Design a protein around this ligand. Structure first.
Ligand SMILES: [Mg+2]
Ligand SMILES: [Mg+2]
Ligand SMILES: [Mg+2]
Ligand SMILES: [Mg+2]
Ligand SMILES: [Mg+2]
Ligand SMILES: [Mg+2]
Ligand SMILES: [Mg+2]
Ligand SMILES: [Mg+2]
Ligand SMILES: [Mg+2]
Ligand SMILES: [Mg+2]
Ligand SMILES: [Mg+2]
Ligand SMILES: [Mg+2]
Ligand SMILES: [Mg+2]
Ligand SMILES: [Mg+2]
Ligand SMILES: [Mg+2]
Ligand SMILES: [Mg+2]
Ligand SMILES: [Mg+2]
Ligand SMILES: [Mg+2]
Ligand SMILES: [Mg+2]
Ligand SMILES: [Mg+2]
Ligand SMILES: [Mg+2]
Ligand SMILES: [Mg+2]
Ligand SMILES: [Mg+2]
Ligand SMILES: [Mg+2]
Ligand SMILES: [Mg+2]
Ligand SMILES: [Mg+2]
Ligand SMILES: [Mg+2]
Ligand SMILES: [Mg+2]
Ligand SMILES: [Mg+2]
Ligand SMILES: [Mg+2]
Ligand SMILES: [Mg+2]
Ligand SMILES: [Mg+2]
Ligand SMILES: [Mg+2]
Ligand SMILES: [Mg+2]
Ligand SMILES: [Mg+2]
Ligand SMILES: [Mg+2]
Ligand SMILES: [Mg+2]
Ligand SMILES: [Mg+2]
Lengths: 167, 98, 260, 143, 188
RNA sequence: UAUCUGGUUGAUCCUGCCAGUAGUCAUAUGCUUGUCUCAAAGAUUAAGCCAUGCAUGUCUAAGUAUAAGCAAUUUAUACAGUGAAACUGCGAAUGGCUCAUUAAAUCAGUUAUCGUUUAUUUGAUAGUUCACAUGGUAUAACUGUGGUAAUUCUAGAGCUAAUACAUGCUUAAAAUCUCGACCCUUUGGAAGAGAUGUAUUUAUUAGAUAAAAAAUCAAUGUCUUCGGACUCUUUGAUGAUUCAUAAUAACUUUUCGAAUCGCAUGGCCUUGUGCUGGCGAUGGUUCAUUCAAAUUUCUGCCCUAUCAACUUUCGAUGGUAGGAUAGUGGCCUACCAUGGUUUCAACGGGUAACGGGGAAUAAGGGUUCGAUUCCGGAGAGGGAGCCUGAGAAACGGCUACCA
RNA sequence: GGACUUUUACUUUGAAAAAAUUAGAGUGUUCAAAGCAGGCGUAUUGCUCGAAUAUAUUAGCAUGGAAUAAUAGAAUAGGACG
RNA sequence: GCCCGUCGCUAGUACCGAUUGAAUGGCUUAGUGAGGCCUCAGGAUCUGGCGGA
């Protein structure tokens, strides 16, 4: 059962140390790398199963692949992704275009759909408005609070000169 | 990992173990007050000697030394509080003789 | 020892906390915050030992999660919050308000205060220096920084804070003859308004304090906390007002109130 | 020390960020930098007038004096720009209720501003570790 | 890896010290960058508590400043001709602090002639005014004016390329230049 | 709580050891054993070896739900309740256990950072970035086809999420510098062209103050009463700085500067899907605080000379420069020098040695013990190495060698 | 703030000072070893005292003392004040 | 009377002793040298004219 791993140029089995993002390795801790066995990328009579993908159809329809077709389990869930899955314009109100999933529980023929994400909605713009406003508000709240201090010393020089012109 | 539950023992023992004079006295005292083991006597001798070196220690302190007075009147107070030291003997020079 | 210690065994907890010895095996580790660990007191202790409000520690959290408690302002629901000296513990329920002040023995005592007095608090300035784009700031015992303070506000001086906002209103100074409060060693709790300071360049300037009983004593600078003018404090002091009653004095008057 | 040789290293000696300008006319030829450590230690005039360059010097160099301030008798002037002093003391042995002569030889940096000999009493202040053994720097010579 | 501790490095008295508390990460030490010229290639390094440090290898251009003129321009580092720590560093033309290098020098003259522009070496109404109010501050040195003909100027590195990632410096002048001049000639 | 007694002689007084005697938070063992409370306990020998099970996981209104999930209710045909799995985040560096190594080490009291790192908590802090009605795929869980005796093994194939991953707009004024198209020759000045957030790197400058004043060379700032004068002018902290902070010319594979989420939803007309606007959550630079860490000053260890000289082979002591570090430092390298400890016991050896708070023994002075409930240190069969991270040279993490 | 100070030992007082331990106060755990509780009314909706003190002693810090015991000072005057 | 030494029996302890004797731990020369880390290259693919992984 040892799986092969692309880019090894070997018809035999070897042992390497793998990390995150690498083939035939699912880490179990942070920064965890464990040494495991791997079969080479060159096919050999020792292989028990070969895995392959069609890239060009032949002359006769195959037993159950060229005939059969199965659908993609899920559909677009990000607003711009539905837009580009239906080649939609940027103003077509995708919430009407999000494909539903008709299902039942008896005569409970309900229709569920995904919470489309990254959508531009009132609350979203309310938040953007609020932030972009709060920034400038404090921006000059502190400028005024700075001038008030400037004046504290501007008129502390009052006594730096009145105790000089009074003694 | 948990606080140590303090302990201590309440009975001393005479160094000489076969002094017939002290043994006979000890026995009559036990048989008089209704004691069961002679160690209930050894015990009383223990607390006595403790109180005695606690007092005798202060007795060499400069008369009227602050802690001497505080703990002195405290000691005599609790002794009369139990009723062993007479009320006339409330200046602690008689505590060495209980 | 590989990192941060997040436990606190018993017998390691501050003594002024008044924790019984056999109550299991650990004390509550105060959290990180405004006051130093060994120089603070947590809410679990306050609401459980000092005020006997909660029976278990499990109940203390149930109490806090309702926003009943607030300190110096906001709710502060951290069961292990390091509430320190001079902090103000208000209480939505019961209308009670408290200020954290020591005894003469050295522990934190329960001291109720007016709703009026609960609006302010003081702080011994521990550092003052310029900062971001030339604006000077002040940091004090509290663990809070106030921007744009008065150019006369130096270090070691006390300050009054609004607590509705941040800015300070008055700032007492560390000058000969000003009400002080000892917070350090076990002279901590004594009060008496200044005798004089020994600079001792290089470190540890010493303060001479005379209680208003004609009794002298000394402590180190970072332990003294000016509070105002002789006889005129700036906060409500606790019973006994820190004057170091002797053991014989307190026992004598302990037996004074003799008959019920 | 440094024995009348100003530029004797493979690298050019200079004080960091102390810029002399060749365009301008000048009667100093070296903008010098100096300070007073404090605690009542007069910056020796030989430090300000001096030609030397010492990074570890408490007055002309980039080092601060903080911590203990001790005194001792110089025992070894053999190493360059450093000395070993013998600080004596007497240890109390409680059982016998008497003392015993002990000693310790601490090494301390010596700036070229001071000129020392062996047998002279001297005061040194603790500074940042500047070597494997030296932890103090000479600040004033009593002898 | 490396350990900058003192458990080893036996005591000043000469005694040998036994191994206690085997090596920990805080007493760590890493390998040198040994930065060389050209094809700027830098790599990040995770120092204590984040705080990335930029180990620079193969660096070709740096920011060099003319101190007597209060200016800073970036030029291409041409080579290394002297290093007080190791002659081998100059032989390999490695880049480390205090290294004496040679720089393009054309920017530092393009600015001069955009500046007073008094044909150092060997017409706008508004430009002549400043040129005139700048003159008498144009003669610089019988030792730095010469290097422009060579088209390479002697500078000294002041940064830590193996730490900062940048390799900056300042042009040499006055007695510092006099020192390195006698060094270079009297040596070769 | 300041005590002695039996044993050398035919008898005697001595010296003197033996034996007697009392206690031990001192172990074992023997015999005996009814009650209350209290309740240590595989340290010693073997830091020797271990079957099995358990000892680290974790969700709030508030990152991610199209479970082909339960529940059906309920304004909800984008999402809306409840929620496995999985991602994301955080934690797993605390705890607990043991005393092997360790003798100027650890530890203790006392110091230092003007000698550094610091998740978090707490307090402050950002108008400046040149599709905004909001920009990009590439993936788990899932589906499905598989391999292997065998494990928390995983492969090929097909989808889809974000506070994951990768990006990329924005905002007033103001002032100061640079160039300067023209015009006119004088004392010279102008339309307008850019530049200027923070963070990194470098060079320069300010950062005064020990009591008072002038002349002049080079530039050159406000006010002209066109000889001229230049006018009171500002200053933070420490004992102590090149400090805090600031300015100038540039540098950067360019840090940060909210594309995030919950509960409510309202004003306000010139009715634009216009402009607005409440509470509080996650984040985010820089400073501060707190929890820390790392080094660090002074002084103090048991026996040993049948250990007197020791330290540089292959750093030993110092200097310079650099490199490396979070940062000081022979920490490391290069060059140079010849230093450094010692009868006031170095150096070496031993230890049935972790250090300390402390325990036992009660005239006092002492003697003896501390593996062990608290503090500190060290380790996880022996070594070394390292990933993640704020923090580990971690071991209920990984890698290698030995057993 | 400036200008300058012969060095020590000893003794006093004080600060700094973890808890438990220990010495020790209070409190009647039914006694006691212990524990830091507890004690009071209107026991109907509260009143109230506590959680001491001592102890570190070698070294470092701070302060008073000037006996005891050292060190240095003016002799080729290269002395002291001005 | 006391008393000394060789000689002889039993038992025990330690010493000297061919075996260049044996064993256990701590270092360490010389030689060989795993592994991870840093670095010069590499380029299964995988995507951004000339760079990245
Ligand atoms: Mg979203
Ligand atoms: Mg806590
Ligand atoms: Mg300067
Ligand atoms: Mg030398
Ligand atoms: Mg006989
Ligand atoms: Mg006889
Ligand atoms: Mg006879
Ligand atoms: Mg005996
Ligand atoms: Mg045990
Ligand atoms: Mg064992
Ligand atoms: Mg659902
Ligand atoms: Mg619905
Ligand atoms: Mg632990
Ligand atoms: Mg240490
Ligand atoms: Mg991709
Ligand atoms: Mg200043
Ligand atoms: Mg300056
Ligand atoms: Mg600075
Ligand atoms: Mg509306
Ligand atoms: Mg021997
Ligand atoms: Mg000899
Ligand atoms: Mg060096
Ligand atoms: Mg030699
Ligand atoms: Mg000896
Ligand atoms: Mg051992
Ligand atoms: Mg004896
Ligand atoms: Mg121990
Ligand atoms: Mg021991
Ligand atoms: Mg042992
Ligand atoms: Mg421990
Ligand atoms: Mg470990
Ligand atoms: Mg084992
Ligand atoms: Mg080994
Ligand atoms: Mg390990
Ligand atoms: Mg385990
Ligand atoms: Mg563990
Ligand atoms: Mg053999
Ligand atoms: Mg390398």
């Amino acid at each position: 059962g040892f799986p092969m791993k692309q880019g090894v140029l070997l018809p035999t089995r070897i042992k390497l140390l793998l990390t995150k993002n690498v083939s035939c390795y699912r880490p179990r801790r942070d920064g965890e790398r464990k040494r495991k066995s791997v079969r080479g990328a060159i096919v050999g009579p020792d292989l028990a199963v070969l895995a392959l993908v069609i890239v060009k159809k032949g002359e006769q329809e195959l037993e159950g692949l060229t005939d059969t077709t199965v659908p993609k389990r899920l559909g677009p869930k990000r607003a711009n992704n539905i837009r580009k899955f239906f080649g939609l314009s940027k103003e077509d109100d995708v919430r009407d275009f999000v494909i539903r999933r008709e299902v039942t529980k008896g005569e409970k023929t309900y229709t569920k759909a995904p919470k489309i994400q990254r959508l531009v909605t009132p609350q979203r713009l309310q938040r953007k408005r609020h932030q972009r406003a709060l920034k400038v508000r404090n921006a000059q709240a502190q400028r005024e609070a700075a001038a008030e201090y400037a004046q504290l010393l501007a008129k502390r020089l009052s006594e730096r000169k009145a105790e000089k012109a009074e003694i | 990992p948990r606080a140590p539950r303090t302990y201590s023992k309440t009975y001393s023992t005479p160094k000489r173990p076969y002094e017939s004079s002290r043994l006979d006295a000890e026995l009559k005292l036990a048989g008089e007050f209704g004691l069961k083991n002679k160690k209930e006597i050894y015990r009383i001798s223990f607390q006595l000697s403790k109180i005695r070196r606690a007092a005798r220690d202060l007795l060499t302190r400069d008369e009227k030394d602050p802690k001497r007075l505080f703990e002195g009147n405290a000691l005599i107070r609790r002794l009369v509080r139990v009723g062993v030291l007479s009320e006339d003997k409330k200046k602690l020079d008689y505590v060495l003789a209980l | 020892a590989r990192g941060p210690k997040k436990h606190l065994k018993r017998l390691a907890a501050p003594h002024h906390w008044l924790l019984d010895k056999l109550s299991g095996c650990y004390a509550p580790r105060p959290s990180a915050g405004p006051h130093k660990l060994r120089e603070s007191l947590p809410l679990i202790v306050f609401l459980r030992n000092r005020l006997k409000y909660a029976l278990n520690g499990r109940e203390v959290k149930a109490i806090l999660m309702q926003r009943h408690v607030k300190v110096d302002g906001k709710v502060r629901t951290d069961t292990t919050y390091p509430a320190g000296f001079m902090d103000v513990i208000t209480l939505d329920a019961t209308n009670e308000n408290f200020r954290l002040v020591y005894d003469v023995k050295g522990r934190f005592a329960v001291h109720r205060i007016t709703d009026e007095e609960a609006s302010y608090k003081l702080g011994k300035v521990k550092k003052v220096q310029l900062g971001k784009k030339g604006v000077p700031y002040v940091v004090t015992h509290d663990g809070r920084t106030i921007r744009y303070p008065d150019p006369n506000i130096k270090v070691n001086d006390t300050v009054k804070i609004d607590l509705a906002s941040g800015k300070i209103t008055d700032f007492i100074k560390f000058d000969a003859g000003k009400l002080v409060y000892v917070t350090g060693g076990r002279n901590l709790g004594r009060i008496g308004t200044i005798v004089h300071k020994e600079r001792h360049d290089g470190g540890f300037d010493l303060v001479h304090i005379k209680d208003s009983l004609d009794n002298t004593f000394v402590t180190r600078l970072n332990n003294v906390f000016v509070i105002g003018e002789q006889g005129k404090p700036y906060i409500s002091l606790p019973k006994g007002k820190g004057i170091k009653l002797s053991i014989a004095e307190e026992r004598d008057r302990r037996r004074a109130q003799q008959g019920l | 020390s440094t024995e009348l040789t100003v530029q004797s290293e493979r690298a050019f000696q200079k004080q960091p960020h102390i810029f002399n300008n060749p365009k301008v006319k000048t009667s100093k030829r070296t903008k010098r930098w100096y300070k007073n450590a404090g605690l009542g230690f007069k910056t020796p005039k030989t430090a300000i007038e001096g030609s030397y360059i010492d990074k570890k010097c408490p007055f002309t160099g980039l080092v601060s004096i903080r911590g203990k301030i001790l005194t001792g008798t110089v025992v070894s002037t053999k190493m360059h720009r450093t000395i070993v002093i013998r600080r004596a003391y007497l240890h109390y042995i409680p059982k016998y209720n008497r003392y015993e002569k002990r000693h310790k030889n601490v090494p301390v940096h010596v700036s070229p501003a001071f000129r020392v000999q062996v047998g002279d009493i001297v005061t040194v202040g603790q500074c940042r570790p500047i070597s494997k053994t030296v932890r103090f720097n000479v600040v004033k010579v009593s002898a | 890896g490396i350990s900058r501790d003192s458990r080893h490095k036996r005591s000043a008295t000469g005694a040998k010290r036994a191994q206690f508390r085997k090596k920990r990460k805080f007493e760590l030490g890493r390998q040198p960058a040994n930065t060389k010229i050209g094809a700027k290639r830098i790599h990040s390094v995770r120092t204590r508590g984040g705080n990335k440090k930029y180990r620079a290898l193969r660096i070709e251009t740096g920011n060099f400043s003319w101190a007597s003129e209060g200016i800073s321009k970036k030029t291409r580092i041409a080579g290394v001709v002297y290093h007080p720590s190791n002659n081998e560093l100059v032989r390999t033309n490695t880049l480390t602090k205090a290294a004496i290098v040679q720089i393009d020098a054309t920017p530092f003259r393009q600015w001069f002639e955009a500046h007073y522009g008094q044909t150092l070496g060997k017409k706008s109404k508004n430009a002549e005014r400043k040129w005139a109010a700048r003159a008498a501050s144009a003669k610089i040195e019988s030792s730095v004016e010469s290097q422009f003909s060579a088209g390479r100027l002697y500078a000294c590195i002041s940064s830590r390329p193996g730490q900062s990632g940048r390799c900056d410096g300042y042009i040499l002048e006055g007695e510092e230049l006099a020192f390195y001049l006698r060094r270079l000639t009297a040596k070769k």
